[PDB]
Amino acid sequence: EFMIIYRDLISHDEMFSDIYKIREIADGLCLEVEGKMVSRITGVDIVMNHHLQETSFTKEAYKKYIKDYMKSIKGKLEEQRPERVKPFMTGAAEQIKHILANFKNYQFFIGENMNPDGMVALLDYREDGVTPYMIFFKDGLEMEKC
């Protein structure tokens, strides 16, 4: 019955909803959302459905951005879920290293409001080369349900 909407905790933008196959990955740090190409005008269904905007980054610019972004999420956790801080930080350090190491594989998308402090979702494709999937930071999302 219910449908859950995932909103960017910092920018309040709607990021996605549970109408897609969602998997928790990176030991609970991220949510991987699988989508489909929709040519209605080609595009990823997740991006079109939630009005995500594609953006671009130099690696050095992205590196500065996610460290500050993850630290802002750490601040929210210290306030709302203190026990989550340590595993979040350890996982964040590892995931940041992972994203930087595979930096060129991704396309970057932000919420409709395009708040520079908001989350930047990562898009890449499955091995079939046609099935898109997007990565979001679980702790940077708030759930809304109805």
Side-chain angles (χ1 to χ4, degrees):
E1 175 275 290
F2 299 84
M3 180 184 81
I4 300 170
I5 294 179
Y6 293 76
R7 188 176 307 283
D8 185 319
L9 183 67
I10 300 293
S11 73
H12 308 298
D13 282 310
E14 173 182 303
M15 300 302 276
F16 60 101
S17 71
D18 66 355
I19 63 180
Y20 314 97
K21 183 171 294 179
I22 296 168
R23 291 295 152 57
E24 200 171 87
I25 72 170
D27 270 62
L29 194 82
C30 307
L31 288 184
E32 184 196 65
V33 188
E34 187 175 284
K36 300 172 179 53
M37 294 315 293
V38 157
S39 61
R40 329 300 176 181
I41 311 306
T42 313
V44 179
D45 60 353
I46 304 157
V47 172
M48 301 179 70
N49 287 341
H50 311 285
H51 304 99
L52 305 183
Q53 309 290 308
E54 176 170 29
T55 185
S56 65
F57 287 88
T58 54
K59 189 168 175 171
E60 284 298 317
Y62 180 81
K63 181 166 175 57
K64 178 179 164 49
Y65 158 84
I66 23 79
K67 297 191 301 178
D68 293 333
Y69 171 79
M70 240 51 266
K71 281 279 179 53
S72 74
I73 294 312
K74 168 187 188 293
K76 296 290 179 182
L77 295 181
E78 293 177 304
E79 160 188 314
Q80 314 177 298
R81 286 195 284 156
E83 70 294 335
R84 175 68 182 152
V85 181
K86 169 66 172 54
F88 169 77
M89 286 301 283
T90 288
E94 190 181 324
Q95 181 63 12
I96 288 308
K97 181 180 313 308
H98 169 67
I99 296 306
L100 294 173
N102 297 275
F103 191 73
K104 295 178 184 178
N105 298 335
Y106 311 110
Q107 270 174 279
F108 308 92
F109 289 84
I110 57 189
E112 187 163 36
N113 303 336
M114 299 177 81
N115 180 329
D117 296 309
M119 179 189 301
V120 173
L122 277 20
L123 167 76
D124 195 353
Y125 290 73
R126 294 301 186 200
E127 306 305 305
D128 59 10
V130 298
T131 302
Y133 66 83
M134 299 184 68
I135 303 167
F136 301 82
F137 291 102
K138 190 183 173 190
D139 303 286
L141 304 168
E142 37 180 30
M143 297 173 78
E144 185 180 305
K145 63 177 304 182
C146 181

Coordinates of all heavy atoms in Angstrom, one line a residue, residues 1-46:
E1 N 0.8 -1.2 0.0 CA 0.0 0.0 0.0 C 0.9 1.3 0.0 O 0.9 2.0 -1.0 CB -0.9 0.0 1.2 CG -1.7 1.3 1.4 CD -1.0 2.4 2.1 OE1 -0.8 2.3 3.3 OE2 -0.6 3.4 1.4
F2 N 1.6 1.5 1.1 CA 2.4 2.7 1.2 C 3.4 2.8 0.1 O 3.7 1.9 -0.7 CB 3.2 2.6 2.5 CG 2.4 2.6 3.8 CD1 1.9 1.4 4.3 CD2 2.1 3.8 4.5 CE1 1.1 1.4 5.4 CE2 1.3 3.8 5.6 CZ 0.8 2.6 6.1
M3 N 3.9 4.0 0.0 CA 4.9 4.4 -1.0 C 5.8 5.3 -0.2 O 5.3 6.1 0.5 CB 4.4 5.1 -2.2 CG 5.4 5.5 -3.2 SD 4.8 6.5 -4.5 CE 4.9 8.1 -3.7
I4 N 7.1 5.0 -0.2 CA 8.0 5.9 0.6 C 8.8 6.8 -0.3 O 9.3 6.4 -1.4 CB 9.0 5.0 1.3 CG1 8.2 4.0 2.2 CG2 10.0 5.8 2.1 CD1 9.1 3.0 2.9
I5 N 8.9 8.1 0.1 CA 9.6 9.1 -0.6 C 10.9 9.4 0.1 O 10.9 9.5 1.4 CB 8.8 10.4 -0.8 CG1 7.6 10.2 -1.7 CG2 9.7 11.5 -1.4 CD1 6.7 11.4 -1.8
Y6 N 12.0 9.4 -0.6 CA 13.3 9.7 0.1 C 13.7 11.1 -0.3 O 13.8 11.4 -1.5 CB 14.4 8.7 -0.4 CG 14.1 7.3 0.0 CD1 13.1 6.5 -0.6 CD2 14.8 6.7 1.1 CE1 12.9 5.2 -0.1 CE2 14.6 5.4 1.5 CZ 13.6 4.6 0.9 OH 13.5 3.4 1.3
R7 N 13.9 11.9 0.7 CA 14.2 13.3 0.5 C 15.6 13.6 1.0 O 16.1 13.1 2.0 CB 13.2 14.2 1.3 CG 13.3 15.7 1.1 CD 12.1 16.3 1.9 NE 10.8 15.7 1.6 CZ 10.2 16.0 0.5 NH1 10.6 16.8 -0.5 NH2 9.0 15.3 0.3
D8 N 16.3 14.6 0.3 CA 17.6 15.0 0.6 C 17.5 15.8 2.0 O 16.9 16.8 2.1 CB 18.1 16.0 -0.5 CG 19.5 16.4 -0.3 OD1 19.9 16.7 0.9 OD2 20.3 16.5 -1.3
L9 N 18.1 15.2 3.0 CA 18.1 15.8 4.4 C 18.6 17.2 4.5 O 18.2 18.0 5.3 CB 18.9 14.9 5.3 CG 19.0 15.1 6.8 CD1 17.7 14.9 7.4 CD2 20.1 14.2 7.4
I10 N 19.6 17.6 3.6 CA 20.1 18.9 3.6 C 19.3 19.9 2.8 O 18.9 21.0 3.3 CB 21.6 19.0 3.1 CG1 22.5 18.1 3.9 CG2 22.1 20.4 3.1 CD1 22.7 18.6 5.3
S11 N 19.0 19.6 1.5 CA 18.2 20.5 0.6 C 16.7 20.3 0.6 O 16.1 21.2 0.0 CB 18.8 20.2 -0.8 OG 18.3 19.0 -1.3
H12 N 16.2 19.2 1.1 CA 14.8 18.9 1.2 C 14.2 18.5 -0.2 O 13.0 18.4 -0.3 CB 14.0 20.2 1.7 CG 14.6 20.6 3.0 ND1 14.6 19.9 4.2 CD2 15.2 21.8 3.4 CE1 15.2 20.5 5.1 NE2 15.6 21.7 4.7
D13 N 15.1 18.4 -1.2 CA 14.6 18.0 -2.5 C 14.2 16.5 -2.5 O 14.7 15.7 -1.7 CB 15.8 18.0 -3.5 CG 16.1 19.4 -4.0 OD1 15.1 20.1 -4.4 OD2 17.3 19.8 -4.1
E14 N 13.2 16.2 -3.3 CA 12.8 14.8 -3.4 C 13.8 14.1 -4.2 O 14.2 14.6 -5.3 CB 11.4 14.7 -4.1 CG 10.9 13.3 -4.4 CD 9.6 13.3 -5.1 OE1 8.6 13.9 -4.6 OE2 9.5 12.8 -6.2
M15 N 14.4 13.0 -3.8 CA 15.5 12.3 -4.5 C 15.0 11.1 -5.3 O 15.4 10.9 -6.5 CB 16.6 12.0 -3.6 CG 17.2 13.2 -2.9 SD 17.9 14.4 -4.1 CE 19.5 13.7 -4.3
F16 N 14.2 10.3 -4.7 CA 13.6 9.1 -5.4 C 12.5 8.6 -4.4 O 12.2 9.1 -3.4 CB 14.6 8.0 -5.7 CG 15.3 7.5 -4.5 CD1 14.9 6.2 -3.9 CD2 16.4 8.1 -3.9 CE1 15.5 5.7 -2.8 CE2 17.0 7.6 -2.8 CZ 16.6 6.4 -2.2
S17 N 11.8 7.5 -4.9 CA 10.7 6.9 -4.1 C 10.9 5.4 -4.2 O 11.7 5.0 -5.0 CB 9.4 7.3 -4.6 OG 9.1 6.7 -5.9
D18 N 10.2 4.6 -3.4 CA 10.4 3.2 -3.5 C 9.6 2.5 -4.6 O 9.1 1.4 -4.4 CB 10.1 2.6 -2.1 CG 8.6 2.7 -1.7 OD1 7.9 3.4 -2.5 OD2 8.3 2.1 -0.7
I19 N 9.5 3.1 -5.7 CA 8.8 2.5 -6.8 C 9.9 1.8 -7.7 O 9.6 1.3 -8.8 CB 8.0 3.5 -7.7 CG1 9.0 4.5 -8.3 CG2 7.0 4.2 -6.9 CD1 8.3 5.6 -9.2
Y20 N 11.1 1.8 -7.2 CA 12.2 1.1 -7.9 C 12.8 0.0 -7.0 O 12.5 0.0 -5.8 CB 13.3 2.1 -8.2 CG 12.9 3.4 -8.8 CD1 12.7 4.5 -7.9 CD2 12.6 3.6 -10.1 CE1 12.3 5.8 -8.4 CE2 12.1 4.8 -10.6 CZ 12.0 5.9 -9.8 OH 11.5 7.1 -10.2
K21 N 13.6 -0.8 -7.6 CA 14.3 -1.9 -6.8 C 15.4 -1.1 -6.0 O 16.3 -0.5 -6.6 CB 14.9 -2.9 -7.7 CG 15.5 -4.1 -6.9 CD 15.9 -5.2 -7.9 CE 14.7 -5.9 -8.5 NZ 15.1 -7.0 -9.4
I22 N 15.3 -1.1 -4.7 CA 16.3 -0.5 -3.9 C 17.1 -1.5 -3.0 O 16.5 -2.4 -2.4 CB 15.6 0.5 -2.9 CG1 14.9 1.6 -3.7 CG2 16.6 1.1 -1.9 CD1 13.9 2.5 -2.9
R23 N 18.4 -1.3 -3.0 CA 19.2 -2.2 -2.3 C 20.2 -1.4 -1.4 O 20.7 -0.4 -1.8 CB 20.1 -3.1 -3.2 CG 19.2 -4.1 -4.0 CD 18.6 -5.1 -3.0 NE 17.4 -5.7 -3.5 CZ 17.2 -6.4 -4.6 NH1 18.3 -6.5 -5.4 NH2 16.1 -6.9 -5.0
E24 N 20.4 -1.9 -0.2 CA 21.3 -1.2 0.7 C 22.7 -1.8 0.4 O 22.9 -3.0 0.4 CB 21.0 -1.5 2.2 CG 21.5 -0.5 3.2 CD 20.9 -0.8 4.5 OE1 21.5 -1.6 5.3 OE2 19.9 -0.1 4.9
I25 N 23.7 -0.9 0.1 CA 25.0 -1.4 -0.2 C 26.1 -0.7 0.6 O 25.7 0.2 1.4 CB 25.3 -1.2 -1.7 CG1 25.5 0.3 -2.0 CG2 24.2 -1.7 -2.6 CD1 26.1 0.6 -3.4
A26 N 27.3 -1.1 0.5 CA 28.4 -0.5 1.2 C 28.2 -0.5 2.7 O 28.3 0.5 3.4 CB 28.6 1.0 0.8
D27 N 27.9 -1.7 3.2 CA 27.6 -2.0 4.6 C 26.6 -1.0 5.2 O 26.8 -0.6 6.4 CB 28.9 -2.0 5.4 CG 29.6 -3.3 5.5 OD1 29.9 -3.9 4.4 OD2 29.7 -3.8 6.6
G28 N 25.5 -0.7 4.5 CA 24.6 0.2 5.1 C 24.8 1.7 4.8 O 24.0 2.5 5.2
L29 N 25.9 2.1 4.2 CA 26.1 3.5 3.9 C 25.3 4.1 2.8 O 25.0 5.3 2.8 CB 27.6 3.7 3.7 CG 28.1 5.2 3.7 CD1 28.3 5.6 5.2 CD2 29.4 5.4 3.0
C30 N 25.1 3.3 1.7 CA 24.3 3.8 0.6 C 23.1 3.0 0.2 O 23.0 1.8 0.5 CB 25.3 3.8 -0.6 SG 26.9 4.7 -0.3
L31 N 22.3 3.7 -0.6 CA 21.1 3.0 -1.2 C 21.3 3.0 -2.7 O 21.6 4.1 -3.3 CB 19.9 3.8 -0.8 CG 19.4 3.6 0.7 CD1 18.1 4.4 0.8 CD2 19.3 2.2 1.1
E32 N 21.3 1.9 -3.3 CA 21.5 1.7 -4.7 C 20.1 1.5 -5.4 O 19.4 0.6 -5.0 CB 22.4 0.5 -5.0 CG 22.7 0.4 -6.5 CD 23.2 -1.0 -6.7 OE1 22.5 -2.0 -6.5 OE2 24.4 -1.2 -7.0
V33 N 19.7 2.4 -6.2 CA 18.4 2.4 -6.9 C 18.5 2.1 -8.3 O 19.2 2.8 -9.1 CB 17.7 3.8 -6.7 CG1 16.3 3.8 -7.2 CG2 17.8 4.3 -5.3
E34 N 17.9 1.0 -8.7 CA 18.0 0.5 -10.1 C 16.9 1.1 -10.9 O 15.7 1.1 -10.5 CB 18.0 -1.0 -10.2 CG 18.2 -1.6 -11.6 CD 18.3 -3.1 -11.5 OE1 19.3 -3.6 -11.1 OE2 17.3 -3.7 -11.9
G35 N 17.2 1.7 -12.1 CA 16.2 2.3 -13.0 C 16.1 1.6 -14.3 O 16.5 0.5 -14.5
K36 N 15.5 2.4 -15.3 CA 15.4 1.9 -16.6 C 15.5 3.1 -17.6 O 15.1 4.2 -17.2 CB 14.0 1.3 -16.8 CG 13.7 0.1 -15.9 CD 12.2 -0.4 -16.0 CE 12.0 -1.6 -15.1 NZ 12.4 -1.4 -13.7
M37 N 15.9 2.8 -18.8 CA 16.0 3.9 -19.8 C 14.6 4.1 -20.3 O 13.9 3.1 -20.6 CB 16.9 3.5 -20.9 CG 18.4 3.4 -20.5 SD 18.9 4.8 -19.5 CE 18.8 6.2 -20.6
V38 N 14.2 5.3 -20.4 CA 12.8 5.6 -20.9 C 12.9 6.7 -22.0 O 13.4 7.8 -21.7 CB 11.9 6.2 -19.7 CG1 10.8 7.0 -20.3 CG2 11.4 5.0 -18.9
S39 N 12.6 6.4 -23.2 CA 12.6 7.3 -24.3 C 11.3 7.9 -24.6 O 10.6 7.7 -25.6 CB 13.1 6.6 -25.6 OG 12.2 5.6 -26.0
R40 N 10.8 8.8 -23.6 CA 9.6 9.5 -23.8 C 9.7 11.0 -23.4 O 9.4 11.8 -24.3 CB 8.5 8.8 -22.9 CG 8.7 7.3 -22.6 CD 8.6 6.5 -23.9 NE 8.9 5.1 -23.6 CZ 8.9 4.1 -24.5 NH1 8.7 4.4 -25.8 NH2 9.2 2.9 -24.1
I41 N 12.2 11.0 -26.2 CA 13.2 11.7 -25.3 C 13.8 10.6 -24.4 O 13.2 10.3 -23.3 CB 12.5 12.8 -24.5 CG1 11.7 13.7 -25.4 CG2 13.5 13.6 -23.7 CD1 12.5 14.3 -26.6
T42 N 15.0 10.2 -24.7 CA 15.7 9.2 -23.9 C 16.1 9.8 -22.5 O 16.4 11.0 -22.4 CB 16.9 8.7 -24.6 OG1 16.6 8.3 -25.9 CG2 17.5 7.4 -23.9
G43 N 16.1 8.9 -21.5 CA 16.5 9.3 -20.2 C 16.3 8.3 -19.1 O 15.5 7.3 -19.4
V44 N 16.9 8.4 -18.0 CA 16.7 7.5 -16.9 C 15.4 7.8 -16.2 O 15.1 8.9 -15.8 CB 17.9 7.6 -15.9 CG1 17.7 6.6 -14.7 CG2 19.2 7.3 -16.6
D45 N 14.6 6.8 -15.9 CA 13.3 7.0 -15.3 C 13.5 7.7 -13.9 O 12.7 8.6 -13.6 CB 12.5 5.7 -15.1 CG 13.2 4.6 -14.4 OD1 14.4 4.8 -14.0 OD2 12.6 3.6 -14.1
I46 N 14.4 7.3 -13.1 CA 14.6 8.0 -11.8 C 14.9 9.5 -11.9 O 14.3 10.3 -11.2 CB 15.9 7.4 -11.0 CG1 15.7 5.9 -10.9 CG2 16.0 8.0 -9.7 CD1 17.0 5.1 -10.7

